[PDB]
Structures are given as structure tokens and as C-alpha cells.
């Protein structure tokens, strides 16, 4: 479950390394954001002269979580860290090649751009 | 509320535990022990396990009962006289009887734990 102060790992090559969440984008008052949810977030650290710098407020989409996601088929799935990818207002990834696994949930959300670039769509 | 669970007990743990042990010791030393109704009902089930266990024989079962009762001689007596007497009597190796007396001073209801015979 991601929330306001939560730090996320960056799954893509956008140049950012870690972004703290800023606001979970959803209802007028959504408490948490899980896989496939888009969030506003400040960049808290980034590679030198990347595409996006520190302090840049950006939109991003959760791809991995530490809290396990329940599947309709009774199955479940859990990662080692909370990660996310930076996106456009067009809702498309600012970066290219996005490394590290992702949840199948991203598919039913319209993020096939990501699942395509993603190596392990688990 | 959460009494959806097995039995009840006073004191803390190490205390109440040593309590069950200490009653059992006496109870296997005298066969007939008078005590408060509650203490009795709980002690009832505790001893029955010790008997049915002594009903076995292997030194494992012996050493097992050695954890609660500490006197080697008392447990010796258990595996010799006590257990056989209760041969073939699966379960209910002990009895509890409500006494009509009430301890003066605290007004506690008394009862009796008898090794059945």
C-alpha cells in the first residue's frame, strides 16, 4: 500500500532513482494506492543530468508493492520493494526500457506500453 | 468476550502452573485433597493426563511426567501402585465433590478431589 510520504523505487531509466509519493491520485480522498495506481510524487534523488531532476514533481504509476496483491483466482503476489514508473499526462512512460518485473494488473489498466517494455510481466 | 476459548485460571502463568503441579503432587500423595471448587475442576483434568500417561510405561512417558512432578519416588509410586489400579478405566481417573462447608473469613466454597475407586 502506497501513501503520501512513501518512498518508491524507479523501475525505468527516466533518470530518477527514488521518488517519495506526494498524493495518491484517485477519489476525493483515497487512503492508499496499490499496483496500477497513478500518483503524484516528488523526485527525491536522481542520476546526474537525467531526463528528470530532483525536486521535479511528477506523475507515476505503481508497478510493484511490498504488500501482497490478491488475485480473483484466489492467487496472490508480493514483491521485495515498492516501485513505480514516471508517466506523461498522456499517461505514457517518460523513459524507455523499464527494468524489473511488474504485476499483471497493469494490463487491465491500459498500461500495455509498460508491460511490453517490461521484461518479466509476472 | 474472547472466553470463546478453553478454560480459565488465576494468578499469572509460572505461578498458576506451579500451582497445578503443587496440587497434583499433594493429590498423588494423599489421593483425597480438599480445595476450592474452581481450583479443583482445573486440577481435575491436569492429573488425569498424568495418570493416563503413567498408564503407559516407556521411560519417555516416565521422564515426561518427571517434568511436572519432581519427586522420583512419587512418580515411582505412580507407575507402580497408582496406574495399575486404574487399568482399563479409560478416562475419569479422578472425582470432584462439592462440600457443604464454607471457609470462614473469605466465604470460599470448598470441594473434594478424590482419586476414584
Amino acid at each position: 500500500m502506497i501513501q503520501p510520504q512513501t518512498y518508491l523505487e524507479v523501475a525505468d531509466n527516466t533518470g530518477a532513482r527514488k521518488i517519495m509519493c506526494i498524493r495518491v491520485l484517485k477519489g476525493s480522498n483515497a487512503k492508499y494506492a496499490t499496483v496500477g495506481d497513478v500518483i503524484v510524487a516528488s523526485v527525491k534523488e536522481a542520476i546526474p543530468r537525467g531526463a528528470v531532476k530532483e525536486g521535479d514533481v511528477v506523475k507515476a504509476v505503481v508497478v510493484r508493492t511490498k504488500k501482497e496483491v490478491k488475485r480473483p483466482d484466489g492467487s496472490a503476489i508480493r514483491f521485495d520493494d515498492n516501485a513505480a514508473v514516471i508517466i506523461n499526462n498522456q499517461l505514457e512512460p517518460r523513459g524507455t526500457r523499464v527494468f524489473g518485473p511488474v504485476a499483471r494488473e497493469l494490463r487491465e489498466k491500459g498500461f500495455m506500453k509498460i508491460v511490453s517494455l517490461a521484461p518479466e510481466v509476472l | 468476550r474472547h472466553l470463546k476459548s478453553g478454560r480459565k485460571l488465576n494468578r499469572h502463568s509460572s505461578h498458576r502452573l506451579a500451582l497445578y503441579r503443587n496440587q497434583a503432587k499433594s493429590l498423588l500423595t494423599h489421593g483425597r485433597i480438599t480445595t476450592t471448587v474452581p481450583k479443583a475442576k482445573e486440577l481435575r483434568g491436569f492429573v488425569d493426563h498424568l495418570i493416563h500417561l503413567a498408564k503407559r510405561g516407556d521411560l519417555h512417558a516416565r521422564r515426561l511426567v518427571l517434568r511436572d512432578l519432581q519427586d522420583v519416588k512419587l512418580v515411582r509410586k505412580l507407575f507402580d501402585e497408582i496406574a495399575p489400579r486404574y487399568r482399563d478405566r479409560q478416562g475419569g481417573y479422578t472425582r470432584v465433590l462439592k462440600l457443604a462447608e464454607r471457609r470462614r473469613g473469605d466465604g470460599a466454597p470448598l470441594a473434594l478431589v478424590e482419586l476414584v475407586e
Binding site: - | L97, K98, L99, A100, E101, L112
Partner: protein, 52 residues
């Protein structure tokens, strides 16, 4: 002595009233097989003994 304090002396009437359900209730006893003596149900008894 502190915060909560009785605002008025409770009248003797209102006092006694509260002690309405205060009254005791007699013990329950039954004749035994042994003596004609009265034992409380589900019990042994001195000067009477028992069986089994």
C-alpha cells in the same frame, strides 16, 4: 473531597428505597438419604457421610 460530591443529603426515604433489593435470600436445602438432616443440594455433609 474532590470533583464529584453529593449535592444534597439523600432523604431517609430515598435512602431506604435504594436498599430495596438489598434484602437477603434464604439458603436452599433438602433432606438427605442418611439423616433427616438438611443438606444443600449436590453436596456431602458432616454427621451424615455418603456413598460411592
Amino acid at each position: 473531597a474532590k470533583h464529584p460530591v453529593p449535592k444534597k443529603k439523600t432523604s431517609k426515604a430515598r435512602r431506604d428505597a435504594r436498599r430495596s433489593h438489598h434484602a437477603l435470600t434464604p439458603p436452599i436445602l433438602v433432606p438427605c438419604p442418611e439423616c433427616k438432616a438438611m443438606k444443600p443440594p449436590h453436596t456431602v455433609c458432616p454427621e451424615c457421610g455418603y456413598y460411592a
